[PDB]
Amino acid sequence: MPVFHTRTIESILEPVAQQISHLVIMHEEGEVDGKAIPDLTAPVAAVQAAVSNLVRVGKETVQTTEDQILKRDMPPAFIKVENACTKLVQAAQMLQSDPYSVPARDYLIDGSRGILSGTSDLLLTFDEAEVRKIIRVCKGILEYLTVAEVVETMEDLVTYTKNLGPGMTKMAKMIDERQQELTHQEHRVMLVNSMNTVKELLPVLISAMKIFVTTKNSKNQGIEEALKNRNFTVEKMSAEINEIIRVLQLTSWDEDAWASKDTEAMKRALASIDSKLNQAKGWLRDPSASPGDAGEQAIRQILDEAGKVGELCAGKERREILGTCKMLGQMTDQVADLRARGQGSSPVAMQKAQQVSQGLDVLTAKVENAARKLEAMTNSKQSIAKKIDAAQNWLADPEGEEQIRGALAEAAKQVATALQNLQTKTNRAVANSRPAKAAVHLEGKIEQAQRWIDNPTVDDRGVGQAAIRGLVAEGHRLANVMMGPYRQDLLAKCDRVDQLTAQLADLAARGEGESPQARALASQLQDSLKDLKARMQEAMTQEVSDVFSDTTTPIKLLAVAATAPPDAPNREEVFDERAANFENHSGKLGATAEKAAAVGTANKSTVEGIQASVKTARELTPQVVSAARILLRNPGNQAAYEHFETMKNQWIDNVEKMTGLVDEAIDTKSLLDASEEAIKKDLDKCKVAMANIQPQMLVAGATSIARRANRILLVAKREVENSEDPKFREAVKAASDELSKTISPMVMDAKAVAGNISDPGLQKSFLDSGYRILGAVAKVREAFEKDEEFPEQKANQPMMMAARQLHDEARKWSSKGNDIIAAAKRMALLMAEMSRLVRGGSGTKRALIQCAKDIAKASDEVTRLAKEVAKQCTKAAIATNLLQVCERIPTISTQLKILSTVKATMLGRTNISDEESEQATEMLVHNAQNLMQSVKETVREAEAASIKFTLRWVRKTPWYQ
Ligand SMILES: [Ca+2]
């Protein structure tokens, strides 16, 4: 099994597999055509030289290495390489006498496959031991984080610190280089993110240890919260280091990453369900609470936490959570409706809601069954495969209950091969046990839903249905905040899409699927999705413009409620309230940011970033509250002040970058319409505030207006650092500068009217300044041959389904006139050929290798011209994003060439294929999908970068809506 996770392996294994492609090409020229095989002497000598380098440095390594694992795993590579090497040399010797020798060609096709396998295994052992070093350092730091609790003296604090130094420095350097030596870009992203999180967590660590030790040397009263924050820091840092250790051992795409994410989100739904369980169960059972209240929604969103669990369990276990969720949802609806009319406390208002909520305690129990279930499934999954199967697979050459412990929790060297077979079987069952998941960014969800609604191939891609369900769930989440327009976007559109999709499902499983009765209804559902996208982005924009207007005043009031004088009144009466409003504000911001990441127009990178910052703030709120409680506890103490300032600054910066990333995910002109609407509404509350003599309300509204104007100044300065032309830098700046001109006059005029609230001239001055701000924001807004067909042939196909998904996606646009759609069409066609060639095996070797070479060539065309597109385009975000989709193309093309050469050395269906040939088909399929859809995203985003010269993206199909 070949590997490609580093640039050194690739730089070594690409020319090797290339010369091997030559040798198997001449092998086919010999075996299929009976042609003279020429002087293999020079090429075999070059191969055996470039490989004898690896063998030589390896043999020198095993002498001077203290690594025992290397001493075990390295000589077998020496044998697997030397054998095939000498075998190829022998083939070169025999084919000098008789260039038609039938056993000399047996030794030519066995050695090339053997030199590929052996070379890959040898490099894999090197790499493996190189990482084992890095993991040795990481485990060093992990063990050093456990001795953090023994520090009780400032002497122990400084000593602990200075000794922690060198290991941290060495780890950071090692990871910074290893990530630069990796080919899988996502792995690099994970290493960078984790190491950055640890490095950003060190100062918080020494701060928490500092307040712990100052609180310990003296007899201060903040000892508990201090150890809470310190133990939390050890927890988070140790967890991130463990993430580093897991990623470092990855040699392919993420295979078991879904497990940990699914189980941690699974537990997150419950850790979040606890609090709202208590609160909502406590203050709903009251005889009335006006609907739309935050305490009312406190149940309506609880069920949402169950839904995200129901979307994680497989399609069958969805039963309990889905049916219970629907019944609880409709019975609470009746609670709100009945309680908000002339009749409350008719037993239907008590006896129904009571049995229901007593059932809320039941669906809160059903979700833990699936949560415990799945985990035991992941802990058993990794415990069997990793801890016993590998460890005693190595030690096959005694003691027993390792293979017993693996064999019990599941349900010579060929016996271990059977162990690998059954392991793959268990991984198959585990993989099926979980349902397919829709994308997270919007266009992925609506694209999968789109691919299911128009041609529902019966009983596959429940990913489209899952995308519709995730979109409808996100529409329910966006709706709970509204009031009047609450019913029109929720009831009509969300339930209309749920109903319509239920019609296209019941109308496809129990009946016919291709009739126009299901295709005339499909357009009824295809545009409804567009409606939910439009109004969902609209309501999301309105919600963001309100919730994210002020992100810092609650924690500011909490900061001044902590430094209150000791003789101040109601110190905890106001403090606990500031912490309550601070936790509520933080959670509200987090939820709004989640909706923004789900519905907004932003690439998956910024979606993962928004979710990451929401995770971080959600983790940071309680420790900020506890820091406020160790400052409020000890007045005049400098250490508590430094700690609370550190924590509060952490929260401030995380919510700041959260505000920015969330702002990226919104159509900025729609945002300007939203904030302009908010300035219109704010001024009405000002006229009213004057009419009823409310100067505090007036200055509050004016400060809100100036706040929004400054925010618009931020989003306007953002468009300056994004455009590379003063076409935008005098239009945007020429308006934002005047918007900055209009700010302060409105403020001082507001302060003027606040003292004489009924003076018509003063009021007139203030209002004039305000509407001048309004017009300024308005100006800021105003500143903004022929073709081929797919060779589908009648009856492997999973490799062709990707080729179809690219061909059907490339043909949507221009035939020619742009080399990228020509090259992508040709790539999907050549992939339709390669799918036919993989299960071939009769003169298909040269056609398959030549096919991979063609795919790599067209890939170079796409990458080249797309890189040309990126540098003649405004807004650097689209350019850099396009480059991000472009860099993952040449790597996957090269890996496609090498894998193709392996499959070619095993393509003459001469038998060495217990499952070894089945592996190379699967790797070619995985690589084929990743390449395929990678150039698909490169095509779509390539057109996005062409709306900004260069290409012509005119569409093919004639306009018919
Ligand atoms: Ca003035």
Residue numbers in the entry: 1 to 397, 402 to 415, 463 to 835, 880 to 890, 895 to 1047, 1054 to 1066
Direct quotes from the study:
Vinculin is composed of a N-terminal globular head domain, which consists of 4 α-helical bundles (D1-D4), that are connected to a C-terminal tail via a flexible hinge. The structures show that all vinculin variants consist of five helix-bundle domains four of which (D1-D4) form the vinculin head (Vh) that is connected through a long, partially unresolved, linker (“hinge”) to the fifth helical bundle (tail domain; Vt). In the closed conformer, Vt appears as a rod whose two ends bind to head domains D1 and D4, via residues conserved in vinculin and metavinculin; a small additional contact is made with D3.
In addition to comparing the energy required to open vinculin to that of vinculin-T12, we have created a novel variant of T12 termed T12-A974K, which contains an additional positive charge that might further destabilize head-to-tail interactions, leading to facilitated activation. Surprisingly, comparison of the new T12-A974K structure with the published structure of WT vinculin and of mVin indicated that despite the loss of 4 hydrogen bonds and the weakening of the remaining ones, the crystal structure clearly displayed a closed conformation. The T12 and T12-A974K mutation sites (residues D974, K975, R976 and R978) map to the Vt-D4 interface and hit hydrogen bonds that stabilize this interface (T974-N773, K975-E772 and R978-E775). The loss of these hydrogen bonds also leads to lengthening of hydrogen bonds between back-bone atoms in T12-A974K. Anchor residues N773 and E775 form hydrogen bonds to the side chains of D974 and R978, respectively; mutation of these residues to alanine would significantly weaken the Vt-D4 interactions in vinculin-T12 and vinculin-T12-A974K compared to native vinculin. In T12-A974K the additional positive charge augments the positive potential on the Vt side of the Vt-D4 interface. The structure, however, shows that K974 does not form a hydrogen bond with D4; rather, hydrophobic contacts between the CH2 groups of K974 and the side chain of N773 are observed. The number of contacts involving K974 exceeds the number of contacts that A974 can make and together with the augmented positive potential it is possible that the Vt-D4 contact in vinculin-T12-A974K is stronger than in vinculin-T12. Interestingly, the C state of vinculin-T12-A974K persists longer than that of the T12 variant, but the SO state, detected at low voltage just like in T12, is considerably less stable, and occurs for only a narrow range of collision voltages, before the next transition to the O state takes place. Another interesting observation is that T12 expression in cells converts FAs to force independent, while T12-A974K exerts a nearly opposite effect - namely its destabilization of FA in Y27632 cells.
